Ligand SMILES: N[C@@H](CCC(=O)O)C(=O)O
Ligand SMILES: N[C@@H](CCC(=O)O)C(=O)O
């Protein structure tokens with residue numbers, strides 16, 4: 117007996133955003149974005165009806181070291197609050213151990229965002245000075261990257277961030293960007309290339325991505341371990357990428373609406 | 377009862393190559409390359425002994441539209457000749473339907489290789505002229521990309537390539553590279569960015585990668601459908617990527633040894 121699939125996602129531009137006129141709209145129609153379009157495509161190919169829901173705690177997903185409880189979208193899947201996650205959720209080892217991921221629908225890497233004019237061009241540069249503070253998003257894969265990294269440069273950076281005060285970590289990507297823009301160049305933000313490049317093309321056009329990506333990874337559609345939707349979803353992602361649909365959606369939400 | 381894992385791979389530089397003194401060596405020690413290094417690591421992390429074997433027909437893998445028989449490394453897995461494939465094997469829908477793939481260990485896209493000086497800077501450029509011929513590897517994912525593309529430019533390119541006489545397709549990457557180098561700029565080769573970038577750093581340093589990639593995809597470690605080896609292999613790939621080993625191996629075989 118087919119039932120409506122509960123999709124957990126997160127408000128993160130340009131993946132999922134509230135339409136300007138969202139208040140006069142209902143259900144899935146309230147949202148727009150890359151992942152909204154992707155959800156529709158996946159549902160079509162897999163043949164299911166769905167309901168988009170914004171993750172309760174607004175987080176991507178990390179495990180509490182003391183209680184071992186998962187939060188964010190990962191947690192909603194782990195505890196059965198959602199049937200699938202369609203968002204810019206990074207495929208990682210610790211997550212793959214508790215939930216399933218489709219092959220990546222988008223490739224990306226950690227990058228550096230600076231306020232135009234900031235004397236910084238690489239991660240090494242950030243590590244060799246103190247005047248400019250830098251941080252990452254909380255409960256995300258970027259923070260985890262620096263925590264599980266043995267690489268000398270990334271180790272030094274983590275040592276700084278982990279004990280830096282005031283806290284250099286932010287609750288949302290939006291908070292990180294706002295901090296860069298109002299820091300007069302005294303704050304650099306570490307975020308995924310995908311978001312960095314998006315913001316770079318948005319007014320007031322005062323930020324820019326610098327240096328090469330620190331790593332190479334991807335986002336995947338996630339389902340609870342052993343879910344019957346996993347197989348179809350995985351094949352759907354491959355089909356969409358091969359048809360060029362994923363590439364079309366990328367341009368549609370990143371550069372076609374560019375305002376810089 | 378632990379058994380030696382049979383690994384199928386292909387002689388493709390710099391993934392797997394015969395050592396200069398292979399005749400004086402034995403077994404796995406006869407080979408060297410990115411995938412040889414990766415195979416050793418995957419085996420250590422998954423806890424298995426293995427034997428490297430070069431695919432009999434020297435092909436990646438495609439299903440014959442007549443006999444419906446799979447050839448290449450994919451075939452070796454499908455018919456039970458090998459237990460795992462560790463090579464630059466592209467993750468594609470048609471293949472995922474018959475074998476399993478780990479998450480990607482390398483990201484890449486189709487690209488253009490020209491003899492330096494060739495008046496070509498994009499796929500569109502190639503499609504708008506006829507003086508310069510162009511082709512791809514036969515029996516591979518690149519040829520399939522063009523055969524199935526619905527994008528105007530790529531369809532136009534396929535329409536030309538599939539009917540060009542003599543054949544513009546080649547049996548091995550080396551053959552394609554040699555054709556580019558000896559054609560005085562009258563032949564351009566379409567191949568994966570990974571192989572393009574590698575050749576670009578090899579003497580006589582007469583080739584160049586031009587334009588942006590035509591698509592985005594990845595290589596994955598493949599196992600027979602349902603193999604109990606798949607889970608561990610996938611987690612090993614994620615762990616090795618997160619620890620920076622994959623990036624270290626690409627630098628080692630692509631640039632640290634660059635000849636240009
Ligand atoms: N995509 C990340 C969140 C953003 C970040 O950590 O930079 C995740 O899935 O955790
Ligand atoms: N990596 C490709 C072979 C090379 C190519 O097609 O350009 C495959 O798995 O078929």
Ligand SMILES: [Zn+2]
Pocket residue numbers: 157160161361
């Ligand atoms: Zn579709």
Ligand SMILES: [Zn+2]
Pocket residue numbers: 180181182183
């Ligand atoms: Zn706690």
Ligand SMILES: [Zn+2]
Pocket residue numbers: 417420421
């Ligand atoms: Zn290791």
